[PDB]
Amino acid sequence: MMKKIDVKILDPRVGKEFPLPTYATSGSAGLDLRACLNDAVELAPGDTTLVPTGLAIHIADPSLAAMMLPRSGLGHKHGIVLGNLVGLIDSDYQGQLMISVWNRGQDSFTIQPGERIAQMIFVPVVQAEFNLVEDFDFRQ
Amino acid sequence: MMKKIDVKILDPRVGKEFPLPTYATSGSAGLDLRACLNDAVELAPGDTTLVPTGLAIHIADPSLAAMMLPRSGLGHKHGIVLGNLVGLIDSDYQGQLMISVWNRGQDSFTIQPGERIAQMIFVPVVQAEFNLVEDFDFRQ
Amino acid sequence: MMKKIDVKILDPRVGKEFPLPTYATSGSAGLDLRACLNDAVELAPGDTTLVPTGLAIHIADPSLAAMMLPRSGLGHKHGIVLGNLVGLIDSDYQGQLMISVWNRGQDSFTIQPGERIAQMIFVPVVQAEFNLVEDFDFRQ
Ligand SMILES: O=c1ccn([C@H]2C[C@H](O)[C@@H](COP(=O)(O)NP(=O)(O)OP(=O)(O)O)O2)c(=O)[nH]1
Numbered sequence: 001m002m003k004k005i006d007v008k009i010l011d012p013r014v015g016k017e018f019p020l021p022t023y024a025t026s027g028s029a030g031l032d033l034r035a036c037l038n039d040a041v042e043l044a045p046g047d048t049t050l051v052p053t054g055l056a057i058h059i060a061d062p063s064l065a066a067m068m069l070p071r072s073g074l075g076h077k078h079g080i081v082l083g084n085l086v087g088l089i090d091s092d093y094q095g096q097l098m099i100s101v102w103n104r105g106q107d108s109f110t111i112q113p114g115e116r117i118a119q120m121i122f123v124p125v126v127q128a129e130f131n132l133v134e135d136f137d138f139r140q
Numbered sequence: 141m142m143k144k145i146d147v148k149i150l151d152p153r154v155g156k157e158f159p160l161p162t163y164a165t166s167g168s169a170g171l172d173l174r175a176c177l178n179d180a181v182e183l184a185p186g187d188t189t190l191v192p193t194g195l196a197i198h199i200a201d202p203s204l205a206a207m208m209l210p211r212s213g214l215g216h217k218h219g220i221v222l223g224n225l226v227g228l229i230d231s232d233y234q235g236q237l238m239i240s241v242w243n244r245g246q247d248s249f250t251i252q253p254g255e256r257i258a259q260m261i262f263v264p265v266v267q268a269e270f271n272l273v274e275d276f277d278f279r280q
Numbered sequence: 281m282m283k284k285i286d287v288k289i290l291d292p293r294v295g296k297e298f299p300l301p302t303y304a305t306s307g308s309a310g311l312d313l314r315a316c317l318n319d320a321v322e323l324a325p326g327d328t329t330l331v332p333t334g335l336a337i338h339i340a341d342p343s344l345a346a347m348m349l350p351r352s353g354l355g356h357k358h359g360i361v362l363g364n365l366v367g368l369i370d371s372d373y374q375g376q377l378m379i380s381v382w383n384r385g386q387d388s389f390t391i392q393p394g395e396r397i398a399q400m401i402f403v404p405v406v407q408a409e410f411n412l413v414e415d416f417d418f419r420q
């Protein structure tokens with residue numbers, strides 16, 4: 001399923017020195033986000049740092065949201081994941097997309113400018129209206 | 141997209157002293173869940189505690205599920221996330237919604253009664269039936 | 281919503297000694313994945329290990345993806361979660377499904393052959409095409 005989404009470039013390196021996010025294949029679920037940084041950031045074991053993307057999106061349709069996730073190789077092999085675990089992007093959010101990078105592992109890690117550091121999917125979402133009722137119709 | 145969802149209030153403070161979950165805007169993807177507690181819970185670095193919501197939902201439609209996620213500010217700034225990372229709520233689950241709160245950071249944190257401590261989205265889900273086949277048609 | 285999905289068994293114990301993933305009920309959102317191991321793996325506090333499933337899927341439809349998540353009991357009570365937090369499976373991925381198991385807690389844990397160790401949902405996904413614009417129309 002395809003959707004055109006408005007994007008505003010906030011840093012002039014985005015789309016040039018720091019490529020715009022892209023799907024690798026026609027069958028890819030997510031697209032990689034790149035770190036928009038002036039210099040490398042050394043991230044010690046256990047620490048968190050806020051990484052800018054240099055861009056803003058406006059999903060606009062309230063039936064859609066985005067989720068930011070770790071990349072599997074970074075997470076598994078290096079312990080480089082998200083400090084908020086999963087990032088939820090609202091349809092009406094127009095600010096810069098930010099990435100909370102958390103080193104959950106035991107080795108220091110260098111986050112490099114332009115590096116694909118996380119990924120993002122767009123999923124349909126449903127807004128619930130609660131209907132209060134008295135009765136309906138936690139090894140493993 | 142909108143859906144009416146049955147909710148049963150299990151604690152009489154929910155909808156009163158502890159507001160029912162609500163979307164902040166018409167464009168919000170998720171709604172915040174509040175801690176249904178009698179007193180504050182001090183959560184030491186590295187520990188996990190089970191927080192009640194005081195409510196039960198019945199999604200009922202097997203084409204829908206919910207996912208509980210950390211709130212980004214709590215996760216990034218305070219290390220307050222979910223012990224199970226992401227909570228998956230089944231359409232036929234009618235028990236109390238529970239929140240596994242994990243302090244992944246280095247500072248103690250007070251979980252307060254009524255505090256918005258996590259969030260939840262409703263997403264369409266597909267149930268797979270596996271079709272066994274011999275052949276089809278893991279820095280970063 | 282239902283979808284037939286092609287699966288290739290890579291280990292002859294899968295579907296025999298190690299049951300194929302199944303939904304517990306007609307209302308379940310996710311299905312449990314079992315560890316395809318020759319012997320138990322002891323996973324020390326803080327460590328990560330790669331667990332095979334002994335199977336490959338081909339979702340094939342680019343409007344669908346899968347997400348691997350921790351099981352809530354394992355995550356909350358034992359700290360057994362995913363090293364990449366959430367696993368994203370692309371529609372065109374035809375390799376073995378692998379599970380990055382991370383012990384985030386304080387006690388050693390034995391991963392047993394055949395054990396339900398994680399779960400997986402199938403969700404609709406949307407592929408974005410970015411439309412560059414000058415202007416559109418981060419306690420808690
Ligand atoms: O990883 C993230 C998560 C969120 N965000 C942005 C987009 C989202 O729409 C917005 C709010 O997300 P949350 O509701 O998860 N954060 P929080 O509840 O702390 O902030 P707010 O009070 O604005 O709702 O922050 C990011 O840029 N990166």
Ligand SMILES: O=c1ccn([C@H]2C[C@H](O)[C@@H](COP(=O)(O)NP(=O)(O)OP(=O)(O)O)O2)c(=O)[nH]1
Binds near residue numbers: 140227239353354
């Ligand atoms: O964060 C959560 C996750 C799940 N739940 C509830 C709702 C869900 O439908 C139910 C089962 O979720 P999981 O399958 O993730 N947990 P587990 O596999 O350990 O329990 P079960 O044996 O019941 O499937 O637990 C919560 O209340 N909070």
Ligand SMILES: O=c1ccn([C@H]2C[C@H](O)[C@@H](COP(=O)(O)NP(=O)(O)OP(=O)(O)O)O2)c(=O)[nH]1
Binds near residue numbers: 074364366369380
């Ligand atoms: O938990 C996971 C996550 C991914 N995978 C597989 C399926 C997925 O389609 C593929 C790629 O996932 P990511 O894009 O999250 N990993 P990474 O970006 O490190 O690898 P690649 O360069 O192949 O995109 O790895 C797993 O088997 N288990």
Ligand SMILES: [Mg+2]
Binds near residue numbers: 071072
């Ligand atoms: Mg990738």
Ligand SMILES: [Mg+2]
Binds near residue numbers: 211212
């Ligand atoms: Mg919020």
Ligand SMILES: [Mg+2]
Binds near residue numbers: 351352
């Ligand atoms: Mg379960």
